[PDB]
């Protein structure tokens, strides 16, 4: 309603680096908006540790059941759950292949960070989320990407992607410079499915094209605009 529109507008104006605090203060302010706010606002990704296989994974609502979260590596919930929601045996097999595929994608484009892939069934076809988080080592910053894909079964693919990206430098001439923000894009197309062009190859090419175009847009259109604005202020 009107309050939700005000809350979403507020989230678009407040400093993007403090989105978690602003979201928490917002829900503290109007508790009834909690479910709608969390359904409409993407948050920076949080890392959890799969203590069984010794690997990091990313948390979101798609791999949550109650207060537990499902690891993409072990297919187990932490804290353990008796009957936690699980993908079908067939989807789990594609989920394992997708996590292996996107871990290499993450390694080649990010040279670090953490990735996680979760898939779930739909009435006709399936959907999934691809999550990537890469922080800087040490100037500093963080990249968070959330790709939501829907596969309608030659299949139709729909991709909704959000990238959250902040960067800070501390230098002698320019002092402290902080750039933060986000971009949300969408792409859809039809692709033939076969042994040589499987679902994950189709999804990977879509995610690869999306992140490359979003990265170029963040660099050229958005960051370059703030530089022009600064040169116009004085």
């Amino acid at each position: 309603d009107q309050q939700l529109d005000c809350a979403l507008d507020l989230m678009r104006r407040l400093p993007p680096q403090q989105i978690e605090k602003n979201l928490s203060d917002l829900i503290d302010l109007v508790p009834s908006l909690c479910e709608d706010l969390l359904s409409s606002v993407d948050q920076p990704l949080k890392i959890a540790r799969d203590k069984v296989v010794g690997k990091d994974y990313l948390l979101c609502d798609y791999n949550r059941d109650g207060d537990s979260y499902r690891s993409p590596w072990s297919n187990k919930y932490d804290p353990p759950l008796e009957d936690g929601a699980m993908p079908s045996a067939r989807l789990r097999k594609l989920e394992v292949e997708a996590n292996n595929a996107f871990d290499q994608y993450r390694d080649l484009y990010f040279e670090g960070g953490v990735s996680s892939v979760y898939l779930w069934d739909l009435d006709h076809g399936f959907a999934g989320v691809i999550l990537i988080k890469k922080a800087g080592d040490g100037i500093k910053g963080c990249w968070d990407s959330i790709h939501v894909v829907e596969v309608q079964e030659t299949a139709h693919y729909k991709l909704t992607s959000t990238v959250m990206l902040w960067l800070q430098t501390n230098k002698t001439g320019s002092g402290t410079m902080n750039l933060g923000g986000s971009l949300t894009r969408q792409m859809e197309k039809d692709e033939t499915v076969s042994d040589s062009s499987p679902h994950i190859a189709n999804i990977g090419r879509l995610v690869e094209d999306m992140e490359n175009k979003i990265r170029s847009t963040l660099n050229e259109i958005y960051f370059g605009k703030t530089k022009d604005i600064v040169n116009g202020l004085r």
Binding site: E20, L23, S24, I27, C34, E35, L38, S39, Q43, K46, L59, D61, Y62, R64, D65, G66, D67, A85, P87, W120, D121, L122, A127, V148, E150, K158, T160, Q186, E188
Partner: peptide, 19 residues
């Protein structure tokens, strides 16, 4: 702007923040 797909099913509870 086309709609996102529905999330997973299974009565998984309400959305919440992560500390």
């Amino acid at each position: 702007a086309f709609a996102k797909p529905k999330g997973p099913g299974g009565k998984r509870g309400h959305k919440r923040l992560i500390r």
